[PDB]
């Protein structure tokens, strides 16, 4: 019933983005993160590969294992670049899960990512002006 409205907002959000406009402030944040992530994955291909090799998700993997790798990523502190890397890292874990005919673990990874953002990164993000500051910097 909300199906069609959803297709609509998604399509217009896209079309606005092609011209440097955006549908909302949140859509601006999502576009900046999509483009920053792709740029990270090219420009730091070897480093991203090294990060991604640290963890392979299986049905028996728990949060703590994910939190372990990501804590190492942020050991010297949080910045926007490392935040972008944490998103690409999550992305790569999901894609790897789907590669192996186990799409079911995708939900786990999404929850884990959301949890790590809210518990560890959100204070830094609000300390440094919120996601709108990411958008101007990118």
């Amino acid at each position: 019933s909300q199906s069609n409205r959803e297709l609509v907002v998604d399509f217009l959000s896209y079309k606005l983005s092609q011209k440097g406009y955006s549908w909302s402030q949140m859509a601006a944040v999502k576009q900046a993160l999509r483009e920053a992530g792709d740029e990270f994955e090219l420009r730091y291909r070897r480093a991203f590969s090294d990060l991604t090799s640290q963890l392979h998700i299986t049905p028996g993997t728990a949060y703590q294992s994910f939190e372990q790798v990501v804590n190492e990523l942020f050991r010297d502190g949080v910045n926007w670049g490392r935040i972008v890397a944490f998103f690409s890292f999550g992305g790569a874990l999901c894609v790897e899960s789907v590669d192996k005919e186990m799409q079911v673990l995708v939900s786990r990874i999404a929850a884990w990512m959301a949890t790590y953002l809210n518990d560890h990164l959100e204070p830094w993000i609000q300390e440094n002006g919120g996601w709108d500051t990411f958008v101007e910097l990118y």
Binding site: R43, A47, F48, N79, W80, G81, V84, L137
Partner: protein
Amino acid sequence: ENSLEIEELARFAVDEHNKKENALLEFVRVVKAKEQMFSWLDWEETMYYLTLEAKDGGKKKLYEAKVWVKPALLWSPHGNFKELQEFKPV
């Protein structure tokens, strides 16, 4: 200390140019070096403009090199990431 890093960046430049071009240049010394600090988001990367002498089959010709150094992510024994941009004679 700053000086030794410049040399190691000069060595890599020759070694890397030696593998793409299938050449056998022999590194000797670094005549001149200058560096530029780039940003990406809130990370700092460095571009090095290097001038180096090396023996092309026994003959000692000058070269210009550009090496691009990006900060490491997870700790590495290798330090930072190095990439050869250009290697050409003067």
